[PDB]
Design a protein around this ligand. Structure first.
Ligand SMILES: [Mg+2]
Ligand SMILES: [Mg+2]
Length: 103
DNA sequence: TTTAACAGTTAAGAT
DNA sequence: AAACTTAACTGTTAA
């Protein structure tokens, strides 16, 4: 078990992958029902979970949109006009009108 | 500056 | 592991 760095267990059936919090740029809802996609530095992991629970895990995980939970540690910049959040790995996600200012 | 109506869309709670 | 339901979202628009 990785005890020295905060980690989240992402499950796939009886398989588990432990991912360090700051490996994660953001989570988004999957096109697949009841699944989410964790966007890591250079990998994506699809798993069963809910965005609400993830946002409750840690102050750094913020619900910036109904469909997205961002890791504040990995935000590089925000285009506030278009409400696009940019991450250190060059990915982006969207923030909602009601949540963008609270990031 | 603020809140929210509107109407379409979606996250998440039996088999 | 992977259909049906509806509260609560969404951006636009207005006040
Ligand atoms: Mg890292
Ligand atoms: Mg949080």
């Amino acid at each position: 078990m990785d005890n020295s760095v905060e980690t989240i267990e992402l499950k796939r059936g009886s398989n588990s992958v432990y991912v360090q919090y700051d490996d994660i740029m953001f989570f988004e809802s999957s096109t697949k029902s009841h699944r989410l996609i964790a966007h890591l530095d250079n990998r994506q992991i699809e798993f069963y979970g809910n965005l609400k629970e993830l946002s409750q895990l840690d102050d750094r995980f913020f619900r910036c949109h109904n469909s997205f939970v961002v890791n504040r540690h990995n935000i590089e910049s925000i285009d506030s006009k278009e409400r696009i959040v940019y991450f250190k790995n060059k990915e982006h996600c969207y923030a909602s009108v009601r949540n963008v200012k609270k990031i």
